[PDB]
Amino acid sequence: DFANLTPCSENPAYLAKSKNFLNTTNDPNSGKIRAERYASALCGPEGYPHLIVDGRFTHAGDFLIPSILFLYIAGWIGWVGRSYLIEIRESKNPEMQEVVINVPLAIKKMLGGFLWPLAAVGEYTSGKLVMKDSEIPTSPR
Amino acid sequence: LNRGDKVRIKRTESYWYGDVGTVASVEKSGILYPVIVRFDRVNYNGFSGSASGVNTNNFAENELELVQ
Amino acid sequence: LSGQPPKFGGSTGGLLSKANREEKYAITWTSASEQVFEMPTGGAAIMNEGENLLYLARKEQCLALGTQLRTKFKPKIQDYKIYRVYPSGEVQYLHPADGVFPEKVNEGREAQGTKTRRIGQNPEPVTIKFSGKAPYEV
Amino acid sequence: MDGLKSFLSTAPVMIMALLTFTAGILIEFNRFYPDLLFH
Amino acid sequence: SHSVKIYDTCIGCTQCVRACPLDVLEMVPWDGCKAAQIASSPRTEDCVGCKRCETACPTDFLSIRVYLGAETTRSMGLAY
Amino acid sequence: AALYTHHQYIAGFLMVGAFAHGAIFFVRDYDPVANKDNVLARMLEHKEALISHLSWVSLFLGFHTLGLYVHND
Amino acid sequence: KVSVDNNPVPTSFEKWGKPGHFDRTLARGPKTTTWIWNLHANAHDFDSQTSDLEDVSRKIFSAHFGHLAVVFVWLSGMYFHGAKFSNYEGWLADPTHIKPSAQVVWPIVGQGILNGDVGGGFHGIQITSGLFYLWRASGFTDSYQLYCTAIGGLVMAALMLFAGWFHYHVKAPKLEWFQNVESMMNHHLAGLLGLGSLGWAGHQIHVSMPINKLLDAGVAPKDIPLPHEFILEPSKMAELYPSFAQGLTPFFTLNWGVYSDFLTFKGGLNPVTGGLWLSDTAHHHLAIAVLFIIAGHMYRTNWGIGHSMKEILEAHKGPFTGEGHKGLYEILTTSWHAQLAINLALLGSLTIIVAQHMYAMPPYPYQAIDYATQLSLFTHHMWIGGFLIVGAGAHGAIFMVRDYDPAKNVNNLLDRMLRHRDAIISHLNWVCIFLGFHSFGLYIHNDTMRALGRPQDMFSDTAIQLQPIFAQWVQHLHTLAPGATAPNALATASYAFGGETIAVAGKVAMMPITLGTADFMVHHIHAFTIHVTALILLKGVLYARSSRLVPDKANLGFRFPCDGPGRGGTCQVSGWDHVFLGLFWMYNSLSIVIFHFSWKMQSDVWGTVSPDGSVTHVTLGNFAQSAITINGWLRDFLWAQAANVINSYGSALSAYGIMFLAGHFVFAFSLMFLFSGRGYWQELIESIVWAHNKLNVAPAIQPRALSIIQGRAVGVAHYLLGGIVTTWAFFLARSLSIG
Amino acid sequence: NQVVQAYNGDPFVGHLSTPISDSAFTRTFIGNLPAYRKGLSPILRGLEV
Amino acid sequence: DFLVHHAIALGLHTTALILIKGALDARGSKLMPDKKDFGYSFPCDGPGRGGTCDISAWDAFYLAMFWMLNTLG
Ligand code: CLA
Ligand code: CLA
Ligand code: CLA
Ligand SMILES: CC1=C(C/C=C(\C)CCC[C@H](C)CCC[C@H](C)CCCC(C)C)C(=O)c2ccccc2C1=O
Ligand code: SF4
Ligand code: SF4
Ligand code: SF4
């Protein structure tokens, strides 16, 4: 319920501080736009937006929409980095392709990473994502 | 095992235990470790600050599992 | 031990009280010409022509100079003999122990420290917990 | 010119090319759309 | 005095003896490798323990080992 | 203040020394033959999965906890 | 004497795309991640790349040209930011009210708050480099003149880039051209320094002196005549200086006292600006110019007259020193590292001399009342000069490992230094223990006695006094120097020795600096910490080849980790590791020097001036009673004066608040590399390699932990990056706040 | 001439015969100090120390 | 209060990570498969094999003491 978190539209600490919001960019109304945007959040006793991350879809834009947007991009960086590393491993000189990146091969993989979650599920089902424990270098216990 | 045969190192003390290697030569002279195995990953070997290790080690028949 | 000392002006890196109380080390080599060698104590000394007798504090100092006699000189002095000198007058011939340099295999040498197994086939420390002996020992 | 293409495709240059382009995205997105604490 | 042990994975390329600065190691005849020689350690009383032999060993894991044991004047590398 | 800080600093010593003697256990007193396939051997068996996931959790926590503090600074 | 080789190295990009080609062990390609780090460590090690000294010296000459192109671009950037993004025209109208600023930040993510009000409506980063004070002393009036220097800096940088390519790929000089050191010293004393000082004395007389005399008279910067107008029309020039109309005839007929109106030995400071008189500096530079052009005729090159530097070194032998300086000429004409060790030692000493001279004789107008500029310029040139002194101990030890030949080094000074290594070091070891107990233990006695409520038992001015009587006598001799031992000097060399208090804008330019018990103790602290930094680096040079521990360290190299755990442990025995330990002690030495500087200026020099002549200081004279104790250094210096860096958030100085915490982090990040070691980290990576092998994302370039030297190199880099950035943000936020 | 030589003839003992360590004045002062004076019993040379 | 528990969680997990890796690699590792032969507390195995600074299981007690104090700090 967050009884100790008043909304920022009815928070007197935020209302006395939103009129003195500074401009972060060259726009002279940057502090006014931030005052209207942060009014919909939940504020504490010091009039700053406290974010709720527990899983409520009312506060889905606090963490879940950052979570969905991050994991897509971070999955994209990991998947095209993994797929480039697999492709250059089959070449004559796999070592030199890491310090001297085959840039046309890199752009080909990086634009193909928009369908990484469908490619990750399919490669997990095919067994080419996860290696078996018998086929991996192992410490001597 | 012939030259070019792919083996997996079952010798636990080695750097390549669980890694795949390629048989380079087998010595027919009664050697305790007659099978020379070449690897694509060098080991830790060398002084501190060295950019590479050694990719070759001699093994016996009991320490190799057939892969290819 | 016979040999003239190399012409050296003296140094503070040389022998200490251990040389005349516990042990000191002597290196004896025959020089072809009057050359300049780096002392392991710091500084440059000049070889006397013929036999040379140099007293050093450690066996490592005699062998660092002996390594310098092998590879840093064009005539390639390869007959240096290294002795351990005791204060009781005992002179013990150390290197080479059989007259042949140890990187060359020699007949009559006996295997010391050789183990007829791998390092990974050493016994566990739990099986010899109260015996004194190490896993590499027994 | 071919080795100039190889030098421009080296690991220091391409990570400085990408991070400049990544900072080029993020600064410009926070210039036209600043102050985004949440969605 | 330290313990210098040589195991049967020796290939006999004599690199431990050439890296030895204290004349601890030497090559004895042997029948277990192609070079027909194994390193031995008859002079571990002069062993300082600096492990230059283990750096020079090319086999995997190590065909020569130095185990640091009791410290004497010789093994502590003291000129005094 | 003195009572809380004393008991936490003592408990920090006791926790690290617990894993320290946990490591003296594997060095000295551990038998892989008698502990074959039990819960102690299997901790050694997937020790690479244990260390890398603890390395993941520490990096997952530390990149963000410092990252949110440096953001807030 | 000129001997070049026609096109030795072809110009192509084939080696640009093949990294590691310069080293034989890196040309085979990477196998581990150590190859990437070895690519950067060995990139400029030209002696390790090439055994030919001629090809080594050719790489060195062209790398100098490329380095000068970097400095000229950096110089051009400072003049371009002064021309385009600065209030220099605004500052030139009101130097006492407008703060200097030459960096404007873009408005993004709230960082536009750093564009503080520096006066006149301008908003930007308040600069502390002193460039505005330098340009006013150069006569810079309009921003177009700063812009033309910025274009000319890029032209000079392009010519530095062209001459680097020309002298490596087209016409590279031979080894005999490089080894003609008598020609090089004749062309650098009489050339670079002598004509450069003569050119600047010509600039100062014709440009700097008339413009600054009019700017101090009250003439607006719009109404100043241009520098070429003084050259073209000498009627304005003779109006400012009446004996200028006699022309060059009093110069050639030795009637030099005609020029005494603009070539003065005034001394002291200009009361209008607080800087040195440009009549003094032009007469300084001309007297400097005559001496180096005279001194650049000392050495014999082609025409018979002159000195052979070999024959000077051959003659200087004594009874204590054997053969003397014999063979040092062959050392310094064959070893580049031996010359670099001398040049880093003296340039590092020179930059410390520059810092120690520029605060007490401030050479620029309105510099001495900018307490931020005075604190920054002292601190920057202390840190630069201390880093170079550590590099002297580096390339001293690199020469001993690599280029020391004992065949041509028998019984000379370098042979005999090696022969009594235990005599030098153990006495240097003793004098560090004596100074450490008798400077720091004085503080510990003071810290204990003040804690026990015994102020009479302390070492202070109200207790057991330790007066620096020899420095007070030298200070007294300098105050009595005008009229007695410098009779033609109207004022003292500096008011730091004693005498007048100079006020410019209601702020002290310079006061007498009275040295008491606190100044005695902190100078012996400085004498202690310099001696340890000398102890670590001299032992690194002397014991680079051998010791009683490891007698074959010359074969091991200059930069090696150790010789194993044997002999108890030979950890950090290399000459590199003494540079590694010397960098910490240089940080420890210089941080106390700039802390002694920052406290003694604010407590006993800097402050505001009452109209009747009274001076109140920034920290109200707390150096005499609190700089005798570690707690006073903790409380009244560190805790009190960092209130400005921690309350700076939400203001223009909040970037200093960010960077003060930023350096605290990199300090703590260093101790991961310093305290730990790579066999933990290699054992940690190989579990992360397993999780990459689990998902088939293990790289072909095998991930390795850093080498032992690189683990020390990263840790000493972050410790000194973290520590200096902390002090930089502490000094800059405090000294912009005060005044 | 040359006032620094080998200490007592041997150049491989780690010491040097210097004007501080092995001068004529040094040997007649150090050797005539109580701890080194010839013929003194330890009770008198302890007493004078 | 939220951020500092995650610093505490970072402090506990990283201190556990050094300690568990010290315990699980106490018998050996790929850099040193004979750490049980060398005991719990040994300096190193020389600068060979790339360098083996602080490779012992005692040296992970050493490193986690800093992290335990940092967590307790
Ligand atoms: C402020 C100090 C500090 C920092 C941040 C680190 C950082 C870390 N420690 Mg620790 N460590 C420290 C001091 C510190 N430590 C000291 C004093 C010791 C005692 C010797 C150790 C002992 C130690 C051990 C023994 C272990 C750690 C581990 C690690 C990781 C912990 C997981 C984590 O938080 O990662 C996430 C957070 C970070 C990496 C911090 C972010 C760093 C920067 C700010 C962001 C990166 C971008 C950067 C700016 C790019 C550089 C560009 C620049 C060149 C211009 C990480 C590398 C463990 C590890 O590596 O396992 C995973 C490990 O086993 N450390
Ligand atoms: C006139 C200056 C001068 C010159 C000509 C050289 C020349 C050289 N030095 Mg150096 N030296 C000097 C000053 C100088 N030095 C000083 C000031 C120091 C004290 C620190 C030393 C200490 C020293 C040592 C300790 C070593 C050398 C060595 C080298 C050689 C190769 C360097 C190389 O390739 O690594 C290039 C490597 C780098 C450029 C990486 C350094 C990066 C630093 C740590 C961080 C940069 C600081 C930066 C401002 C902070 C921001 C970082 C980031 C945010 C961007 C070469 C002969 C090496 C050698 O073996 O000699 C034969 C070596 O081991 N020198
Ligand atoms: C565009 C013309 C050009 C090209 C194609 C070459 C080509 C060659 N030169 Mg080079 N050279 C040039 C101009 C050029 N040079 C100039 C301008 C200089 C003066 C510094 C020299 C001086 C010189 C030296 C002293 C050496 C070479 C050598 C080399 C070879 C390899 C260089 C390498 O590894 O590159 C890859 C590396 C880089 C491209 C460096 C990247 C930039 C670094 C960080 C330096 C940046 C500072 C820069 C000089 C000035 C900054 C400009 C300013 C505007 C910011 C190759 C045959 C080397 C060799 O092995 O010859 C046998 C050798 O020792 N040259
Ligand atoms: C953490 C640590 C490691 C692990 C560190 C490693 C393996 C290096 C990590 C390097 C990362 C991948 C990049 C470092 C940051 C770069 C300098 C950033 C470059 C610029 C970017 C924008 C690309 C050691 O190897 C080590 C060795 C010896 C003593 C102490 C330590 C030690 O403390
Ligand atoms: S540690 Fe050194 S002295 Fe001992 S056996 Fe090995 S190489 Fe020889
Ligand atoms: S122990 Fe290693 S270095 Fe010595 S002979 Fe055997 S293989 Fe060669
Ligand atoms: S650096 Fe590491 S391996 Fe080398 S001596 Fe020191 S502790 Fe041993």
Numbering used by the authors:
A (entry chain Q): 3 to 143
B (entry chain O): 3 to 70
C (entry chain P): 4 to 141
D (entry chain S): 1 to 39
E (entry chain N): 2 to 81
F (entry chain G): 367 to 439
G (entry chain H): 13 to 751
H (entry chain U): 5 to 53
What does the report in the manuscript say about this coordinate set?
Cyanobacteria use two types of antenna systems: (i) membrane bound iron-stressed induced protein A (IsiA) and prochlorophyte chlorophyll a/b-binding (Pcb) protein families and (ii) phycobilisomes, massive water-soluble pigment-protein complexes. The IsiA/Pcb families contain six trans-membrane helices and shares its overall architecture with two core photosystem II subunits, CP47 and CP43. The IsiA antenna is expressed under high-light or oxidative stress, but is most known for its expression under iron-limited growth. Lower levels of bio-available iron leads to lower amounts of iron-containing PSI complexes within the thylakoid membrane.
The structure of PSI3-IsiA18 from Synechocystis sp. PCC 6803 was determined using Cryo-EM to an overall resolution below 2.8 Å. The structure is consistent with previous reports with the canonical organization of the PSI3-IsiA18 supercomplex, a trimeric PSI surrounded by a ring-forming 18 IsiA protomers. Each IsiA protomer coordinates 17 chls and 4 carotenoid molecules. Each of the IsiA-IsiA interaction interfaces occurs over a large solvent excluded surface area of ~1600 Å2. In contrast, the IsiA-PSI interactions are much weaker, occurring in <1% of their total solvent accessible surfaces. Accounting for the heterogeneity in the data set reveals a surprisingly large conformational space consisting of changes in IsiA-PSI orientations and connectivity. Structure based calculations showed that rapid IsiA-to-PSI energy transfer is always maintained, and even increases by three-fold in rare conformations via IsiA-specific chls.
